[PDB]
Structures are given as structure tokens and as C-alpha cells.
Amino acid sequence: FVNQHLCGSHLVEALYLVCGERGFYFTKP
Amino acid sequence: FVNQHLCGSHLVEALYLVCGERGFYF
Amino acid sequence: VNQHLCGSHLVEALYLVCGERGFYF
Amino acid sequence: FVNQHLCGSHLVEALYLVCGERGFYFT
Amino acid sequence: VNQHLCGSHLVEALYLVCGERGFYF
Amino acid sequence: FVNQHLCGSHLVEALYLVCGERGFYFT
Amino acid sequence: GIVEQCCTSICSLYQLENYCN
Amino acid sequence: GIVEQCCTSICSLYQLENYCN
Amino acid sequence: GIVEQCCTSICSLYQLENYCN
Amino acid sequence: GIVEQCCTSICSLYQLENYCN
Amino acid sequence: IVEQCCTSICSLYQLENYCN
Amino acid sequence: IVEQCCTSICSLYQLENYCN
Ligand SMILES: [Cl-]
Ligand SMILES: [Cl-]
Ligand SMILES: [Zn+2]
Ligand SMILES: [Zn+2]
């Protein structure tokens, strides 16, 4: 799961630059 | 707001390494 | 110099927001 | 892919370095 | 080079999970 | 300093690069 | 759910937004 | 909420985990 | 130089967007 | 060397931990 | 250099050459 | 290196005198 993971890394770098202020809930299944 | 932002960045890098399946709020 | 390292995040956000676009440094 | 998205983010970073004043540029 | 890059996330998760120590290189 | 943390996240990432085999240590 | 939904393939900035509250 | 919580000063791994459901 | 502008205030998603090529 | 080991399974947090000086 | 250097590693007489 | 190199900048002839 090396790579779900190198990724979920850069995803979250990213929801962040983006939900700006309303933010979000992150279910990893 | 340059440097908050340089930083929210290095943050959510790090939430993720760490919550892994339960999800998160806030 | 900050400018030699912002130079480096800028070089990277520029690199996610700029998506594919790139940038001159 | 999420994988090379990730590698470029890396070289941008190397040239900034060798060249100096002299600079360098990245596409 | 995954290895020279995971070598650099790893020199960085190693530089984040490893902090000051440095690492053998 | 989130700022030199953030600069060394960056030099490590740099000598990894200059010395090559010979390595270099980053200490 | 979002991972099921963004790791293998890149999510841009909008999608990423439903999952916003 | 979390920003306020981690930007000028370095956040280590466990803080980060509360915000977890 | 940009070095001199975004490294000087933040740019919204909307302002970075400004040095991109 | 390291590059050899974590770069193959994830290392839970547990396994990265092995290369630090 | 993404590809010269994302597939094998590059020297500095070599990255010298990528300035100015 | 942080002197010759984080507040000004080092060149690599100079970063080379830092290798093994
Ligand atoms: Cl990577
Ligand atoms: Cl930085
Ligand atoms: Zn990476
Ligand atoms: Zn940085």
C-alpha cells in the first residue's frame, strides 16, 4: 500500500491548498 | 498569509502520514 | 538566500496550482 | 500518475543549485 | 532514480520521520 | 524554524546531489 | 467515499471541494 | 480548528491523529 | 523578480495563479 | 544500502524509522 | 534534465554544463 | 555550508571542496 500512501501525501498537499475555509471530512477506507 | 500557507502545506503532509482509516474533522 | 528557498515552494505550488504550466526563474 | 507528479516536483529543485547567478530555467 | 526520489521523500520522510540525525548516506 | 527546516529539507535534498559517490554526509 | 475516490488518479482542485462540508 | 494549530512551529506526528472520527 | 512578489504576499488560489507561466 | 528497504513495503511508520544515523 | 536525471543519476561537470 | 551556502549562495567549486 507504498504508493496509497506517496499519494494520499501529495492529496491531502493539495484539499488543503483547495477547501480553503468550509474544509472537509477524509474517510481513508 | 505566505509563510501559513508554506506551512498548512508541510501539515495536511504530515495528517495524512499519520490517520490513516478513521478519517478526520476540522 | 528566502529568496534562494521560497524560490524553491514557489518553484513547487507553482509547480500544483500551475499544474502542468511551469515557471522562469 | 500520481508517481513522476510526484519526481519533477524533485529536479526543480537541483538546478536551482549548479548554476548560480549565472540561473537556469524548468518546464 | 524511485530509489534516487523515494531516496530524496525518504531523505525528506527520513529528513520528517528522522528529523536532525541525519541519516547515512 | 519552520524556515531553515524548511532550508535543509532543501541542502539535503543539494549535496545529495554535488558529491556523488564519493556521498557526502548531511549532517 | 474520497481515496476510493483520488490515489491513483490525480483529483484537481473542485472535487476535491464536495467533500468539503 | 488545525492551522491555527501547526504553522510557525514545527507539528510532530501524534498531533496530528485527533482530528481523526 | 517573483522571487521578489509571492515571496513578498499570498497568493488565493486565485493570485499564484499570476507567475505561472 | 536504505534506499534498498522502504522503498519496497510501506513502511508503517514503524519501518522508516530503521536509517536514521 | 526530468528524464536525464528521473531515470539515472547526473554529475556536476555534467549539471555545469545546465547553467546559466 | 549554511554560510558559504543559506545566506549567500555557494557555488558547487566551492560545495566540492564538501564532498568526500
Ligand atoms: Cl515521490
Ligand atoms: Cl519553505
Ligand atoms: Zn515525492
Ligand atoms: Zn519549503
Structure notes:
- Chains C, E: This is Insulin B chain.
- The complex is a heterododecamer, with 6 copies of chain A and 6 copies of chain G.
- Chain A is mainly alpha-helical and 29 residues long.
- Chain A has one domain (1-29).
- Chain A is built from 2 helices and no strands.
- Chain A has helices at residues 4-10, 15-19.
- With 21 residues, chain G is mainly α.
- Chain G is 38% helix and 0% strand.
- Chain G is flat.
- Chains E and F meet through helix 2 of E and helix 2 of F.
- The complex binds chloride ion (2 copies) and zinc ion (ZN) (2 copies).
- Residues 6, 9 of chain D line the site of one zinc ion.
What attributes does this structure have?
heterododecamer, A: 29 residues, mainly alpha, flat, G: 21 residues, 0% strand, binds chloride ion, binds zinc ion
Oligomer: heterododecamer
Terminal CA distance of chain G: 14 Å
Number of domains of chain A: 1
Query: What structural category characterises the helix and strand content of chain A?
Result: mainly alpha
Question: Total number of helical segments of chain A?
Answer: 2
Provide the structure class of chain G. mainly alpha
H-E order of chain A: HH
Please indicate the percent range of residues of chain A in DSSP E strands (runs of 2 or more): under 5%
PDB class: hormone
Keywords: hormone, diabetes mellitus
Assembly: dodecameric
Entry title: TyrB25,NMePheB26,LysB28,ProB29-insulin analogue crystal structure
